[PDB]
Symmetry: D3
Subunit: 288 residues, 6 copies
Amino acid sequence: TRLRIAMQKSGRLSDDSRELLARCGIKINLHTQRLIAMAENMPIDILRVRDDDIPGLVMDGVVDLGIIGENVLEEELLNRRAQGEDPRYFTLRRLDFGGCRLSLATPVDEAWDGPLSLNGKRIATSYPHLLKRYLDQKGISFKSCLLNGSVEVAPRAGLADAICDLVSTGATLEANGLREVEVIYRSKACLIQRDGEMEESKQQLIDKLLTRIQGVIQARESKYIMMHAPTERLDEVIALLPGAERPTILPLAMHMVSSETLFWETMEKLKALGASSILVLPIEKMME
Amino acid sequence: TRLRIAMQKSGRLSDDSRELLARCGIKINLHTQRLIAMAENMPIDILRVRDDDIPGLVMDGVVDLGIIGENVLEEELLNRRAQGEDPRYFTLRRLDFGGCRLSLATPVDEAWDGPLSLNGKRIATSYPHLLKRYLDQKGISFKSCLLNGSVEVAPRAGLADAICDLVSTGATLEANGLREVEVIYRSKACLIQRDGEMEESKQQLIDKLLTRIQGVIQARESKYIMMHAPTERLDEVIALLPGAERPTILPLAMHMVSSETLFWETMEKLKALGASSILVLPIEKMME
Amino acid sequence: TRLRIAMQKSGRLSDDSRELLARCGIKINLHTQRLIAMAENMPIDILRVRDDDIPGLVMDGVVDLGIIGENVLEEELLNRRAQGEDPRYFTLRRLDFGGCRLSLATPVDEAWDGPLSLNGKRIATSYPHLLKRYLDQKGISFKSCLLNGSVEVAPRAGLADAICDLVSTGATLEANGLREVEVIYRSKACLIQRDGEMEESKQQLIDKLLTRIQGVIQARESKYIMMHAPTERLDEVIALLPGAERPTILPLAMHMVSSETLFWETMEKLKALGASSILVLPIEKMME
Amino acid sequence: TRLRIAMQKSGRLSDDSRELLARCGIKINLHTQRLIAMAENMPIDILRVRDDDIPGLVMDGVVDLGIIGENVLEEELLNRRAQGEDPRYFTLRRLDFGGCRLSLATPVDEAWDGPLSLNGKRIATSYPHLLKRYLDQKGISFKSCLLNGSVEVAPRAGLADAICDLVSTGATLEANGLREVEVIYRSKACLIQRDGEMEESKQQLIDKLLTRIQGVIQARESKYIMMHAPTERLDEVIALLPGAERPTILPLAMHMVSSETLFWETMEKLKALGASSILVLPIEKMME
Amino acid sequence: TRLRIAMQKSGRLSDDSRELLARCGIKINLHTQRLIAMAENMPIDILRVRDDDIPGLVMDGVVDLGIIGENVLEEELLNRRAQGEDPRYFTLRRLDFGGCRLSLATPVDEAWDGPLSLNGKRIATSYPHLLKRYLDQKGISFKSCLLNGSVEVAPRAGLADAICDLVSTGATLEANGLREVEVIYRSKACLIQRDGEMEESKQQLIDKLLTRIQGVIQARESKYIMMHAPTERLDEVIALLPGAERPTILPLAMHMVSSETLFWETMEKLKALGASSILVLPIEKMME
Amino acid sequence: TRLRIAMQKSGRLSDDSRELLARCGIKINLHTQRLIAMAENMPIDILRVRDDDIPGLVMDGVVDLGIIGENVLEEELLNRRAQGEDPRYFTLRRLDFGGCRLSLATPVDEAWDGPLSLNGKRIATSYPHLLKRYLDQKGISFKSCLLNGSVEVAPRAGLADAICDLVSTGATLEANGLREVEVIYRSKACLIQRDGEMEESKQQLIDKLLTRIQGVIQARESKYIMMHAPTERLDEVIALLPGAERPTILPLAMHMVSSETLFWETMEKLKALGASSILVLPIEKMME
Ligand SMILES: Nc1ncnc2c1ncn2[C@@H]1O[C@H](COP(=O)(O)O)[C@@H](O)[C@H]1O
Ligand SMILES: Nc1ncnc2c1ncn2[C@@H]1O[C@H](COP(=O)(O)O)[C@@H](O)[C@H]1O
Ligand SMILES: Nc1ncnc2c1ncn2[C@@H]1O[C@H](COP(=O)(O)O)[C@@H](O)[C@H]1O
Ligand SMILES: Nc1ncnc2c1ncn2[C@@H]1O[C@H](COP(=O)(O)O)[C@@H](O)[C@H]1O
Ligand SMILES: Nc1ncnc2c1ncn2[C@@H]1O[C@H](COP(=O)(O)O)[C@@H](O)[C@H]1O
Ligand SMILES: Nc1ncnc2c1ncn2[C@@H]1O[C@H](COP(=O)(O)O)[C@@H](O)[C@H]1O
């Protein structure tokens, strides 16, 4: 049939996934209670499902493409491998959204001196396989304690010596007497392809879609920069701005496209280097 | 230590559970991000957790009481039993909230002639163990297809011949080309006790709490009814109103407490039986 | 086929209409985008439509029952009669919700001396037929100015000398330099039957439904009152409480059911008449 | 002119004040941006103002009645008295809403041994006069530190050794490293009259209004109770239920009106005393 | 007096209309309940009215300018013309918002072979005049069925063979057993002038306003594009980018202003044509 | 210790202040109930407090920097000076948000002929010190009437002849029978430093922070403009566009950075001066 892409129906990645495909020129209605939507022009099926189920759909080839976050995907990969299976998939690419970090946390009123210290302790978590891979690699053994939510209760409840959980502002942990202490895994949403052989047409589309994804991401990361021919030191400038597609010089400045962001520190440097009237303009779309 | 009761932190049973204990005279703050709250007077700890984790907490004796819905509890019971374990628990009582029904559903454009018809087919569901117990009992075998959400996609997506899911208004199914066809399990929230021996004091409290629960539930189910001494047929009246604690007769009506509800049909009957000016008054609290 | 009742899909009467039928024991789902819902038990079809269209649906017999407010219904009746037609309908009954009043309003900085004063003036309104019936009856002629909303602009905009509109708090008028000055029509929602002959079964149902409506309305209007045998003046008591179903006397008070409300003024009277410890208890349901 | 009652325009007492007067039979519109509303029937003016300004309006006789919470009123009384003035007012009555408590709080990681311990320390607060009256009475001196909000920062910010603030769930304090330790003042909304002589008519109204207030409050506090003639011990029953208007005895129970609430403990007692089928019914309105 | 512009008080065009005039440099307050607002500087009156009433206000010259959607305007034009009148107006211009499409729809389970097929059938709609103009032109006759909302009930309710309605996501139709089948009219908001002679001053303003409208629309549609002198094929480039105001060439790219949007397809072409690093930058304002 | 910056916890300046520091590269969590937050990298403490308390915190040196609006700051300055104190502070800079204006207002039905007219009258206000400074300077004396909110009641309530209050849309005043008549003070948020000597390190940071503030403000105010070498009149162009950093000329336009905004009037001029295709592009960040 036609192309089948799996995406989270409702949660942390849904708005962003919905948005990418639109931005890639994908007309489709998501204001519907229906879960398997046909795209209004391109021959594309979007299945709105639970994030938890995406890796597997992809690993069983029951869909061709999926948008899912690294942690979930990798957790389920290790799960099957621990059951003896050989799940297979192609990572087409890591995306520019969904960030999150999985971290070790311990009671605030206890000082920390590294992971070895956890040897023999009980750690609660929803990500048993990711935590085990990390400590194993580190030679540390531990007793797992499984919970699917509210993981932060574990310590103040006598369920564990410590926990491993998604953290961001760090609010919950403080409110639950714990503090971050080591990030063991950082994840982003990514785009994955099913295993096996792909037909000419749909693969042509997959290939096509990918490039539009690249452009959408570039455009939001990249910027158009305009300085001032600091003649001499002109060299040192370029090094702080990995343009990757050549500055343009003009007697009277410089005009170039930066893929990365101009953090204050970096501008702070340019300045002291003698650069004047530094400008950054947004780019709405780009094809390079 | 003191009494430990597990309840859903956020979802379908949280408001109602929060409400029962209040109604049972339990001062405690739930407007906090903290997950293990001490009750402001009674020596009680409330752990706000994921519903999915409650059965187990209870079955491992890591808490003493839990409020959780029948389906979730029974699903996890069958899960462990299938792994060879012997999870143990006391059901103190079934509650008056959390209702839901698990049902078989099939594509609307296909006619249905009972469960045998599913023999050999693939059914998708989040409740693999409850579905298997039901069909097994019925002698029907089937191929399971596991999803944790959006279960209704299965058919229109070539993943299954049919699904088994929580249904209520019936909205999703229609929007997903399916129709209900058989209810296989009806669930309500219930109150459960850990296995093992319980100390004097906390058990005294558990015992105490139970009675307050009974009164709160009675009061909302029961009503105060006032009719009119239909002298003769006076008998036939009582039969429609399972009072369970004796009518009261007065020459001039009747005044009694009904545990059940006065549905229209039932009042419709009383009437035709000759009963006049039938009244139903709410009861805010009761101790019987 | 089966019974067909028309109700407003979304607006001022929808919540209340939805509520009545439920209260009358009508299972049906309104959380759906579908507009012609079948009731889950009783053989009933509910068509969710625009209030504006209800009178006509009923007057063309394209449905059997409708819930619609008096003003809208009567406006459309006069509309057709002005076109030469003979729309026909039975009013089964006036309901206990939807109240509103249509009123004449004039610029605040102008003093008012009755309707005759409008003779020859221009009045803006969305209810041209109701306004015309009223002034005609009064012998006053006027120039109509039609608007379907924002009627209050008319004066401060040179479109009319005054307006006729739905008023309630009176907010808009003040904010638009106008003041109420005469109520010409007061409306409530009512229940109407199509013209023609009605089959046995569905009419049986219509007849049945009506009685449940009566009970629901009574119960919310009526109350259970308990005083104190003011022996002598005992007479004067009853007159302030149109019980309509006989007080009950007890030496030791009175116990009776009032259909109307006990306004302060009325209680204020009882009191001064020598009545003590006056009580009013809510009634949740009743069959008389 | 006519009667003038001051009430909070928006905040903690507004909904409840708005509600009382309605419940007292006061038609008036508060869905308006206008701040001095005339009541649609009774000759009453309602001024919607800042709670902070109410005491003074009342103490300057610029309005006749005010609804304001004890803490605010008493704080401003002490303020003026400290400036040398003699603000005067009549408390007509304490209401049944607005509860709150002003309390001393100190850093959690410090143990507490009573108020004397604060002698010589700095305490931050928005209620300098209420705190000073309390410690003065106790012989303790202290250094004040004034803030109008976010008072809980003081300690963790080096601004004070401790704070005195409105507390309820106790959330902020925990999130700010502090714990309650002594309640120094408990407040409720109350109803106050201006100083001076009051005219016949408006005073007649004030007098009238008061009684309706009493009835509204009684009705929500009081309940209708029905037990069972525990013949012998019949005595001991009455003592737990301060009826204040005589039980009613019936051979076959008891039927009476309790002004207070039936807490579990109290019902728990009745029970053990031999009382059976205890009932509590709501009262919607009452005139005693 | 001064200039009078009519706009929808609340609905689909209000936010956008409010926004245009602001963007055109029109200070005025719409956070008010007042319906005829004076603009804080320019001598302009804005009347906030019901969209339904705009065409007519304009056609009766009771205002000078109006913002209203094509369908509504044209429906009312045909309405009057059918009553024998000669409504007159100038279309100053079609705007860049308010899009919508009026379409024929038929039951999903029935296959479609063009409009002739409807000859003799009943079609329900709120736009009787637009539907009639379309089929008349096509030689097809039909029976109209008028509803002002919920038009999608018609078929599943036996009221019509099909419907003609505003469609967008296509949600309602599916939920009501219907599918789109032919778009008969596409509408956008437009700006219209009253008939008759216009004074010097206000016309000067109308003329002025128009140009600012043009600039606001251009700026949001147009973009600044930067490619790379693909020397040879340089020609073929320009054809895909209707610049309308001359590219700019630079040895080292191209820098130009496109009025239209760079759809993927078009960029896809440029690329394959040999164009590199294609950029699109937003334009916030422009005067050409 | 480290740097301490005071900001409003919740109100009119909080979102904007929160935003500036982020924009200045300040990582910190404000989704917390905690009031004294440490910034996740830079050695910075943010105290979330009541705006009313900021001036003083700064004037007592209990924090080093504060973001607070001019009116509040200046009101409290005059307050202390009237008590005999000598509060001291450095204004680092006026910001680009928080605008508001304090104005004299009088009953609509009374005509106005300047401030002298208020001599001897009573004016109500929350800003007694700012109003007094203004009229004093003008030689006018008056009687103050203090209120902390709902100041607009004063006139229609017999409390004052007129009021002085924050005005914006002008809604309240109209709804309270008043009209603006003279703006006496215009305020914006500003950034202030404590009095005294500042250490090397933190001052280094303060100095650093300031420059980032400048860039963030410039970027949002400034724009990138592109015209067309109107050769001759080329001169007259520059005068309308205070570039402050030199246009750039190109035979084929002009390319420059305007610090101010291109209002219509100004573009209207350029145009008539012969300028063509005028463009304005947003600037996201800049370092000059
Ligand atoms: N990025 C995320 N994706 C899924 N869950 C998350 C994510 N971030 C935080 N959570 C959950 O929300 C809480 C952490 O957020 P926070 O309190 O802001 O640090 C923890 O209980 C996490 O389990
Ligand atoms: N009572 C429930 N508890 C948990 N999930 C439910 C419950 N009821 C419905 N759901 C989920 O919500 C949808 C059914 O609701 P409905 O469309 O109203 O019939 C299905 O996808 C169910 O999986
Ligand atoms: N009961 C009602 N039903 C329909 N429209 C109403 C109703 N009441 C008020 N309106 C409209 O809302 C405004 C009146 O409400 P109010 O300002 O509260 O007096 C007027 O513009 C009326 O046209
Ligand atoms: N009843 C109240 N009236 C006015 N302010 C209050 C009241 N209760 C709490 N607050 C403020 O809100 C916070 C306390 O609420 P809580 O965190 O729930 O204990 C404190 O910062 C108080 O200053
Ligand atoms: N653009 C529109 N303007 C006015 N009404 C609309 C518009 N679009 C849709 N509607 C109404 O809303 C429903 C269609 O929206 P949808 O279900 O998203 O396709 C139909 O019932 C239409 O009558
Ligand atoms: N910028 C402001 N900052 C603080 N309070 C304000 C501000 N603007 C208006 N207010 C208050 O809100 C009302 C004025 O807003 P408006 O009715 O839109 O003109 C007055 O009662 C002011 O006291």
